[PDB]
Structure 1
Amino acid sequence: RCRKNTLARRKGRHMGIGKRKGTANARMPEKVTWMRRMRILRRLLRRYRESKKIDRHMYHSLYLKVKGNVFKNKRILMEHIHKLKADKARKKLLADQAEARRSKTKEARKRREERLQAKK
Structure 2
Amino acid sequence: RRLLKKYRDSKKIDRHLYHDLYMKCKGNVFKNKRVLMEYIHKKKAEKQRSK
The answer to whether TM tops 0.5 is yes
- Which interval holds the TM-score relative to the shorter structure? over 0.9
- Higher RCO, Cα 8 Å, sep 6+: 2
Structure whose alpha-carbon radius of gyration is higher: 1
Q: Where do 1:1-120 residues align within 5 Å?
A: 42-92=1-51
Q: Which amino acid aligns with 1:68?
A: G
Name structure 1 gaps, 5 residues minimum: 1-41, 93-120
Residue 85 (structure 1) shift: 0.8
Which string of whole-angstrom CA distances, capped at 9 and with x for unpartnered residues, describes residues 11-67 of structure 1? xxxxxxxxxxxxxxxxxxxxxxxxxxxxxxx00001100000001011220110000
Residue 81 (structure 1) shift: 1.2
Q: Cα RMSD between the aligned structures? A: 0.6
Identity value in percent: 75
More helix per residue: 1
Aligned residue-pair number: 51
Residue 82 (structure 1) shift: 1.1
Deviation >2 Å, runs of 4+: none
Name structure 2 gaps, 5 residues minimum: none
TM-score by length of 2: 0.94
TM-score by length of 1: 0.42
